[PDB]
């Protein structure tokens, strides 16, 4: 099932591709970790998910354990490549002591 | 003046009706009734404690009196 | 729970559990909330409710509002005045002054 | 459960965030997400609705094992109303010596 974010971006959890409607010619390439994080965020529309729970769901299924700086770096790359605002709540933000939040709308293509 | 009822203190209605509830009827209680305990009582602030101490000072008395038997 | 709700003329409602008084802009629909009384307004209301329909003498009203207080009758008069004011009783029908016998509260029904 | 507040405000338990909407479940004019203590305070005030909420209940529900200095009670319920933008002190009411209450318009379950 393909998902649409904020009526602008399109992404699929199965092939890890990003398409911007403003520039449909340029496909945006994302890493597996950040793509899985964004898909986990999209699976729970617009409510807080824990850093601990999201981290353990993303990386223990991978079979290997990493430190918590990895999640922060992955989110930094996600915000940078999506060209989301540096600290304003436009698409993805961080809620301290509670976890991570998404603002972009969810539109399932199929 | 340790021989007068508190009602003779020419106290205002508020202070008189407040101090009447604490079973304080003679000044001998009030001269050692501590400032803090007097402040804790209902309906008695600093600007009334001031007038209580002023009336006491006019007649020689005051608070903070180490004392004797009854 | 032993819940007691008092209905007063002009469809006034006083809920004892929530301690809330409200106008009914329908038979019993709460939408126009006069508010929450203080801890003597509620006490005097409880006194006049507990002695209904008999008038309550002023001495017992004072002894219940001020159990250990040498409080003048002026405070009684103005407490009644403010309770009637905050109940919007300008016509002196809610808390009636029984002439030379004390006070009564006009209450239609009790809902349990 | 969706609680409606004056000025068309909504606090959601089907989600975990506050907003200014005319549509209950639609995220219109988002305020954000209250903190842990703020969310607990909002839940307590909404549960004690329509009754006033005692101060001791709030302090022993927010801080079960904390020696509260008796003044965090007011800073907390000042910034909580600020985060809900209660500039007129109408969204949350204080009835003196009885407690606090929060003005809830309707409950959606």
Automatic annotation (TrEMBL), chain D:
Domain OmpR/PhoB-type: 1-104
Gene symbol of the encoding locus: tcpP
Ranges annotated as DNA-binding: 1-104
Name assigned to this protein: Toxin co-regulated pilus biosynthesis protein P
Signal peptide location: none
